[PDB]
């Protein structure tokens, strides 16, 4: 029977991206379901080995998936991961693209902490989006995980904390829908950009869609600039109209950060926790779903 690593039976495809396909697997030792990422060895720019190292440096972190095996097999590099629950995009669609304010706030709190943890390990994520957060399983069903370090990179030296240098004329990295203004302008990504992207994710949860979503275009690169100019021509206060001011204050604060500034994560969490209390919400992990 078809196995990777002698040990993990390969199952149906469950996802695909620019850095490999994701498949279900079954560990024959325990019957544990797993996720299997495959990357073609004859690819023009090897990456899965680097993502696996990144995952290994993050292990033990709250909401970081465990990597079970990493190796090479035939025409493929292989990374076997712990299987988690549905993504936040899956759950958003399941709830008809409607999240309550309570659910948005509970998630924001954990998501800010996930990003802060990655930053504390000297890496920036660069692909913050609803598909890249997954809920846990069983008694970790209230825990938000962060996945996909395929675009991640170090922003600071591990020993001196010297920040990577500023630069312009970069190509767009990440996803057009959730990228920061700085990214659209070709500026090197840093810690602020992960947090700005999360700000767009949260307003996307509030609204059901973002104003620069679904713009008709022709070439794939005229679409990107139509997104970029719609993103820039939409003031944060128009984007957040109809919702508590904390969401615009969050987005304004991330746009105000300098390239190498350390974000005040505790401040950002406290904006939402304070709003959480004014709504009279209880922290019971009762999500909409």
């Amino acid at each position: 029977e078809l196995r990777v690593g002698n040990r993990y039976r390969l199952g149906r495809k469950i996802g695909s991206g620019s850095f490999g396909d994701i498949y279900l697997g079954t560990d024959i030792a325990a019957g544990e379901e797993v996720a299997i990422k495959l990357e073609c060895v004859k690819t023009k720019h090897p990456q899965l080995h680097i993502e696996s190292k990144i995952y290994k440096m993050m292990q033990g972190g709250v909401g970081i998936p465990t990597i079970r095996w990493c190796g090479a097999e035939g025409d493929y590099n292989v990374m076997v991961m712990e299987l988690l629950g549905p993504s936040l995009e899956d759950l958003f669609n399941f709830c008809s693209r409607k999240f309550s304010l309570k659910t948005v706030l509970l998630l924001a709190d954990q998501m800010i902490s996930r990003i802060e943890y990655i930053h504390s390990k000297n890496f920036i994520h660069r692909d913050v989006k609803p598909d890249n957060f997954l809920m846990g399983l069983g008694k970790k069903g209230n825990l938000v995980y962060i996945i996909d370090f395929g675009l991640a990179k170090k922003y600071r030296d591990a020993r001196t904390h010297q920040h990577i240098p500023y630069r312009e004329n970069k190509n767009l990295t990440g996803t057009a829908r959730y990228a920061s203004i700085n990214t659209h302008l070709g500026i090197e990504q840093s810690r602020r950009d992960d947090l700005e992207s999360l700000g767009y994710v949260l307003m996307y949860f509030n609204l059901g869609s973002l104003p620069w979503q679904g713009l008709k275009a022709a070439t794939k690169r005229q679409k990107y600039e139509r997104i970029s100019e719609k993103k820039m021509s939409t003031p944060i206060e128009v984007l957040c109209k109809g919702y508590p001011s904390e969401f615009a204050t969050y987005l304004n604060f991330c746009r105000s950060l300098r390239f190498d500034d350390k974000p005040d994560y505790s401040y950002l969490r406290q904006l939402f926790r304070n709003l959480f209390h004014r709504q009279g919400f209880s922290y019971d992990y009762v999500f909409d779903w």
Binding site: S18, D127, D148, L151, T173, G174, A176, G214, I227
Partner: peptide
């Protein structure tokens, strides 16, 4: 528009 880019 949600495709991951290098």
């Amino acid at each position: 528009s949600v495709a991951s880019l290098t």
